[PDB]
Amino acid sequence: SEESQAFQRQLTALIGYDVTDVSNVHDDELEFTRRGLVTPRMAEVASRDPKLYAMHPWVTSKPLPEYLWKKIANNCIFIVIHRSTTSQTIKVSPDDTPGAILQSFFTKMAKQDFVLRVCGRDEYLVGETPIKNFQWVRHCLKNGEEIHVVLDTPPDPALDEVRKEEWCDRKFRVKIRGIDIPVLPRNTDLTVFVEANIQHGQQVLCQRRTSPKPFTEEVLWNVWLEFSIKIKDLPKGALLNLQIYCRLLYYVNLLLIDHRFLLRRGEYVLHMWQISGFNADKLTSATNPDKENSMSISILLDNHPIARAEMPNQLRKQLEAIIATDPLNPLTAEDKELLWHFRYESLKHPKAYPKLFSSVKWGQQEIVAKTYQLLARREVWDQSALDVGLTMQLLDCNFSDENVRAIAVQKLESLEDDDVLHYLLQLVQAVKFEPYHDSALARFLLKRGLRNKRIGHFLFWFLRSEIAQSRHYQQRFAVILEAYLRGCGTAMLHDFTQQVQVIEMLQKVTLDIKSLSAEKYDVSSQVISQLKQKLENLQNSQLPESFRVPYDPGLKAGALAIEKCKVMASKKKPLWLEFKCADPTALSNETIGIIFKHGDDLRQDMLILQILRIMESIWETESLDLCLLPYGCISTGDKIGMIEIVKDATTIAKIQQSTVGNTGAFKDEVLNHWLKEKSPTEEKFQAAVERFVYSCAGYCVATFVLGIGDRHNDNIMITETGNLFHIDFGHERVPFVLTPDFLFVMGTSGKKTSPHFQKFQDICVKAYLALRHHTNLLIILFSMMLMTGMPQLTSKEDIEYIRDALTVGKNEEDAKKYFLDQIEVCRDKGWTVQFNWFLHLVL
Numbered sequence: 001s002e003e004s005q006a007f008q009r010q011l012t013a014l015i016g017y018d019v020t021d022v023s024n025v026h027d028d029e030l031e032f033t034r035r036g037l038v039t040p041r042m043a044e045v046a047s048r049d050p051k052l053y054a055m056h057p058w059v060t061s062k063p064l065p066e067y068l069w070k071k072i073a074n075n076c077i078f079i080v081i082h083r084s085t086t087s088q089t090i091k092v093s094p095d096d097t098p099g100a101i102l103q104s105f106f107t108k109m110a111k112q113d114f115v116l117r118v119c120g121r122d123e124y125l126v127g128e129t130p131i132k133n134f135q136w137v138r139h140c141l142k143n144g145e146e147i148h149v150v151l152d153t154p155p156d157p158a159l160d161e162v163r164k165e166e167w168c169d170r171k172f173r174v175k176i177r178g179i180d181i182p183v184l185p186r187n188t189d190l191t192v193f194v195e196a197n198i199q200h201g202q203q204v205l206c207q208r209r210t211s212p213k214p215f216t217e218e219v220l221w222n223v224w225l226e227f228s229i230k231i232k233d234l235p236k237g238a239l240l241n242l243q244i245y246c247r248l249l250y251y252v253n254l255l256l257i258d259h260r261f262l263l264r265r266g267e268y269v270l271h272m273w274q275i276s277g278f279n280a281d282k283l284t285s286a287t288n289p290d291k292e293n294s295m296s297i298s299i300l301l302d303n304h305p306i307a308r309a310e311m312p313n314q315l316r317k318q319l320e321a322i323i324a325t326d327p328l329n330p331l332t333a334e335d336k337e338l339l340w341h342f343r344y345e346s347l348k349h350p351k352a353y354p355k356l357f358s359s360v361k362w363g364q365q366e367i368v369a370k371t372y373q374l375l376a377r378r379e380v381w382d383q384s385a386l387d388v389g390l391t392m393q394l395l396d397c398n399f400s401d402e403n404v405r406a407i408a409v410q411k412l413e414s415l416e417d418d419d420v421l422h423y424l425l426q427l428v429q430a431v432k433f434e435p436y437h438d439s440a441l442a443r444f445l446l447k448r449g450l451r452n453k454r455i456g457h458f459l460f461w462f463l464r465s466e467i468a469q470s471r472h473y474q475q476r477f478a479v480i481l482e483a484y485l486r487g488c489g490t491a492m493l494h495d496f497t498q499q500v501q502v503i504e505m506l507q508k509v510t511l512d513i514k515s516l517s518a519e520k521y522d523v524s525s526q527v528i529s530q531l532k533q534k535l536e537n538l539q540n541s542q543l544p545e546s547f548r549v550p551y552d553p554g555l556k557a558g559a560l561a562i563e564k565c566k567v568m569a570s571k572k573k574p575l576w577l578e579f580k581c582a583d584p585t586a587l588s589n590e591t592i593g594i595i596f597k598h599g600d601d602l603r604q605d606m607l608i609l610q611i612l613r614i615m616e617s618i619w620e621t622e623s624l625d626l627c628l629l630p631y632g633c634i635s636t637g638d639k640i641g642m643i644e645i646v647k648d649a650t651t652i653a654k655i656q657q658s659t660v661g662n663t664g665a666f667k668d669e670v671l672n673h674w675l676k677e678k679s680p681t682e683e684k685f686q687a688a689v690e691r692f693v694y695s696c697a698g699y700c701v702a703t704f705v706l707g708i709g710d711r712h713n714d715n716i717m718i719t720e721t722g723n724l725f726h727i728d729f730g731h732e733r734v735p736f737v738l739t740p741d742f743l744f745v746m747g748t749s750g751k752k753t754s755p756h757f758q759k760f761q762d763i764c765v766k767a768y769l770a771l772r773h774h775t776n777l778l779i780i781l782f783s784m785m786l787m788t789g790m791p792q793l794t795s796k797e798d799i800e801y802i803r804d805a806l807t808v809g810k811n812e813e814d815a816k817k818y819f820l821d822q823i824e825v826c827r828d829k830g831w832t833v834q835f836n837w838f839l840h841l842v843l
């Protein structure tokens with residue numbers, strides 16, 4: 001069961017999707033996959049340390065960078081500690097453990113076992129790691145801040161409680177019967193054919209078509225389409241893609257071999273996705289749930305089972321050439337046959353694997369077996385250092401083979417939770433490329449979130465983001481998420497519930513507000529009147545007392561600071577909300593600020609941000625900080641989500657709008673003053689100058705690589721404390737925004753050099769070639785990003801921006817003189833394109 005069916009309503013309402021609904025399924029893959037996951041759930045649930053799980057200590061094995069060792073001049077560190085408006089400061093050794101520090105203190109107060117929390121956060125310093133290796137610590141030192149700790153008793157694990165569970169030789173052919181759309185888009189007698197492809201990693205094996213007929217709401221052929229491929233020459237995860245043309249209009253897929261290794265048979269009525277205008281949505285095995293409006297297509301199957309010598313110089317070298325190559329550089333057939341003939345030598349090169357496996361005639365069963373025997377002797381891969389870029393490459397759409405994909409995941413198993421988070425978003429996206437629901441990668445995500453609450457948390461929001469916005473993949477994700485929620489344990493089930501109700505309330509309000517102020521660049525008094533009036537009517541008796549901040553899960557927000565809440569000036573109407581901090585042990589009356597925004601699809605922003613944090617960890621590997629500000633942002637539902645407000649920052653635009661704010665005029669010395677009025681000391685000013693030269697330089701490089709460099713002033717921000725950063729990614733050319741104002745801070749005006757500018761270029765080029773060292777990674781992540789994150793994008797030209805941008809093939813010299821002349825465009829242009837946003841208000 002009775003209660004056992006409430007849980008299921010609870011789950012469904014947390015998901016925003018019903019994983020018991022069978023209204024849209026032509027088989028039992030999803031249900032089977034729900035059944036399949038209980039073990040690996042119950043596995044990880046059964047084996048997780050309960051107290052450690054509850055404290056989710058957030059921790060890294062990575063070394064402390066050069067820059068933060070210079071921040072320590074005494075091989076020793078200061079930690080204040082409190083009990084009840086009592087507090088003392090302790091000189092700690094950077095290699096000291098929490099448990100070890102309790103000895104130096106079970107010395108002090110009084111002249112059982114307790115634990116150290118951070119003041120204000122539901123973040124703990126526990127377990128056998130040195131303090132140098134907690135992420136909070138490295139955070140405090142970066143910005144130059146005290147470490148504040150309170151001793152309370154540990155979270156009871158009985159709070160993590162988990163609910164008890166309760167579980168041929170024929171050629172291939174296919175009768176195309178016909179199509180059916182109830183209402184026709186264009187009407188004027190047009191002409192229409194079907195196209196049926198057999199697919200395996202956008203490798204196409206065979207293709208057949210139909211005789212085109214008149215496009216009326218019903219079209220019937222009744223034909224057998226005999227393909228070139230043999231039944232026994234079919235691989236697992238081959239898709240029967242079916243498409244409609246006159247040109248592309250609808251598409252749909254059927255996995256030819258099903259999740260039991262069974263050849264697929266019988267009649268299918270399939271409701272088709274319509275094109276808008278390659279793309280992961282295009283890959284899905286899912287069918288359109290809108291049965292009333294959708295094009296659909298009947299078909300039929302009656303087709304059972306199934307489950308050296310020494311190479312010469314000038315060829316080794318061709319091979320090494322081929323292997324050295326980037327991921328997006330396609331293989332000649334000459335190349336592919338080469339990789340094949342010399343498969344066993346290619347096997348000694350882990351970088352060869354993507355290439356080598358995209359050199360398989362997956363359409364021949366004989367070869368795939370050989371390929372599998374090739375996977376047997378994996379000594380060289382199994383023992384190789386984890387290369388994420390390489391690993392990821394084997395997870396993208398190019399690869400559809402169960403076993404290939406699974407070796408990549410084996411490698412991931414060896415990531416620490418730190419790195420899991422880094423790549424979590426993109427790993428969660430990669431599910432779209434899996435041919436089946438149930439998958440080693442799925443299973444790997446599932447595990448690791450059940451293992452660590454932080455991952456678990458982000459995994460929730462990531463899967464929820466996609467479930468709510470996408471019909472192509474919501475069934476699949478929904479299934480995985482339910483699998484997660486069933487083992488995260490009650491505590492979180494409450495937290496998640498808290499969180500969901502709040503963000504569901506606040507989108508009501510968000511949208512309600514757009515309705516009122518039409519476009520009109522002003523926000524009527526009456527709007528704020530009612531914005532305010534609702535937030536009262538929402539706290540009154542309905543909202544939660546408190547809740548974790550989805551983008552920063554250690555922060556529990558409390559009540560709203562209504563006084564300070566508003567709408568923003570946008571053509572959109574975003575909300576500016578501020579909350580009190582539920583956690584009264586916290587140090588400040590400094591509110592929690594969140595923007596809520598309908599209008600742009602924030603999945604894209606999420607992605608750009610995550611990439612941004614990767615580039616940052618890349619610069620960690622050359623001991624480099626560039627002071628990016630990849631603020632918090634979470635996609636939550638349809639063209640809507642939330643954003644961290646960054647305290648004490650304004651818009652580059654607005655810094656112009658202060659002294660002037662004219663109908664579009666710009667001055668050069670103005671930034672520089674905006675810093676001095678905000679820099680109490682003059683030392684701090686030149687620091688603020690310092691922070692900017694980093695932030696500017698990094699944002700210049702990163703933004704050029706991703707190809708999002710030409711922005712408005714309005715969509716760039718600086719902190720009162722010198723930290724520049726771009727925003728609003730959901731939104732003559734110039735490679736990036738290095739304006740004349742940015743340079744008069746550097747001591748230069750359009751055509752000179754200086755002590756702080758010389759510096760800027762120094763950093764830029766160093767940052768730039770640093771990323772070039774991790775080229776393939778950035779290529780693979782961008783490519784996938786485009787494929788999972790975007791509109792439609794040309795499966796050559798859009799994806800391929802980034803290799804011309806990372807100046808591939810080229811030497812650190814040529815490459816530098818590339819990036820350098822990129823700077824001497826913003827010099828020539830200057831205000832020229834900043835100038836331009838507005839004028840085009842009429843062109």
Ligand SMILES: COc1cncc(N2CCc3nc(NC(C)=O)sc3C2)c1
Nearest residue numbers: 574631643644645646647648649727728
């Ligand atoms: C308006 O749409 C957007 C989309 N994406 C990011 C943004 N920014 C995110 C970060 C941010 N921090 C701010 N801090 C202060 C004091 O104003 S404003 C702001 C806005 C806006």
